[PDB]
Design a protein around this ligand. Structure first.
Ligand code: JAB
Ligand code: JAB
Lengths: 217, 207
């Protein structure tokens, strides 16, 4: 089994849905996903979770006190704390394979301006902490990135991307709107099909992701 | 305004939620791909030609769905780990589009003829949001929608360094004193250096 805790100020957005890969995983008892409203650990009347940044700048920064109290209750020393952020280490397929063997992931969802850095620094004295980016784009907060990470990881768990791009794929019918499936794919010749698909893959990779083959992007 | 149509066999999963950025909402409609299936079994995929594992999404089903939802002005977005990379620059570009249609399929793919055919009468962009595989494009659609919509007015280099707020001392850690100094040129220089060190440590590829 695996336990995933997600902490967010948008709990409804992160509520697991039965008809989904994570929903299936949950139902098969392979993972338990629990979502927590960050505001549960506030004490003030207007349940404030953020404040203006020291040093100036646009936006707000999430308060360390509230996150501190939440992670105190949810995490143990065995927890792998995941914090989505544009500023993080890259989250890759390798990362997904690695986290697929973890007993307990806690995903801290915060606005992109950041959670006060002292939260992650403090947590790091007790547990493993991974600040990660799923890609080079900005979201308002970590929530969508958490859903991506959960998807990528849960499909790898026992019971539930190489280094090239997969080429085009086809299915029936063999002709459609005047466009024909590549005759080699209909030929039954596994060796020539494998050769064709290898070529297509390399051709697609050169065009769309030349960086994967060690060329200028 | 902006119109976004999402096509998926998981419409519940992609149903917009009020308590979110996209909920603050610009028009977003989610369509169940099964609405365009031809058989009582509501089949949306089939075995890949040439063999191999997994399934490939049927072109006859997707072709109908797209014929109905797309127009000449449509930008057809297809999330796929085999795509061109989706970046901030892409999100900016798409932020001024009048009509996005996002075709969510399983990662093995939609029959290539669907995109090829569509590209003869509309603009088509197959894109990847990162180097990892998901079972389907659904979560990637959420990310794309999140990244694009926050750039639409009225729906609101180096790595950013650490940020801080009150209190000035917390569990033994003090906010860097430079930040409370009132020397704003120095603060900018300090932040530049923090950004440089973080970019070196976490994303050396950017330098
Ligand atoms: N690119 C990531 S992980 C992100 C999180 C919040 N905003 O962007
Ligand atoms: N990396 C992307 S966009 C993806 C979609 C489905 N599987 O991976």
């Amino acid at each position: 089994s695996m336990k995933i805790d997600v902490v967010t100020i948008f709990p409804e957005y992160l509520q697991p849905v039965r008809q989904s890969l994570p929903g299936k995983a949950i139902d098969a008892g392979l993972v338990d996903v629990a979502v927590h409203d960050l505001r549960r650990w506030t004490h003030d009347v207007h349940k404030s979770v953020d404040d203006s940044p020291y040093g100036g700048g646009p936006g707000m920064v999430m308060k360390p006190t509230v996150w501190g109290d939440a992670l105190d209750e949810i995490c143990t020393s065995e927890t792998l704390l995941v914090v989505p952020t544009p500023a993080g280490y890259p989250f890759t397929q390798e990362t997904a394979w690695q986290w697929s063997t973890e007993d307990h992931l806690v995903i801290a969802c915060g606005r992109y301006e950041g959670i006060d850095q002292r939260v992650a620094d403090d947590a790091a004295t007790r547990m493993r902490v991974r600040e990660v980016s799923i890609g080079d784009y900005v979201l308002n907060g970590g929530e969508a990135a958490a859903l991506v990470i959960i998807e990528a990881v849960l499909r790898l768990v026992p019971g539930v991307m190489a280094s090239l791009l997969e080429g085009p794929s086809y299915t029936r019918p063999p002709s459609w709107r005047g466009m024909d499936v590549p005759p080699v794919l209909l030929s039954g010749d596994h060796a020539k099909i494998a050769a064709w698909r290898a070529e297509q893959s390399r051709q697609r990779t050169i065009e769309r992701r030349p960086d994967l083959l060690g060329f200028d992007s």
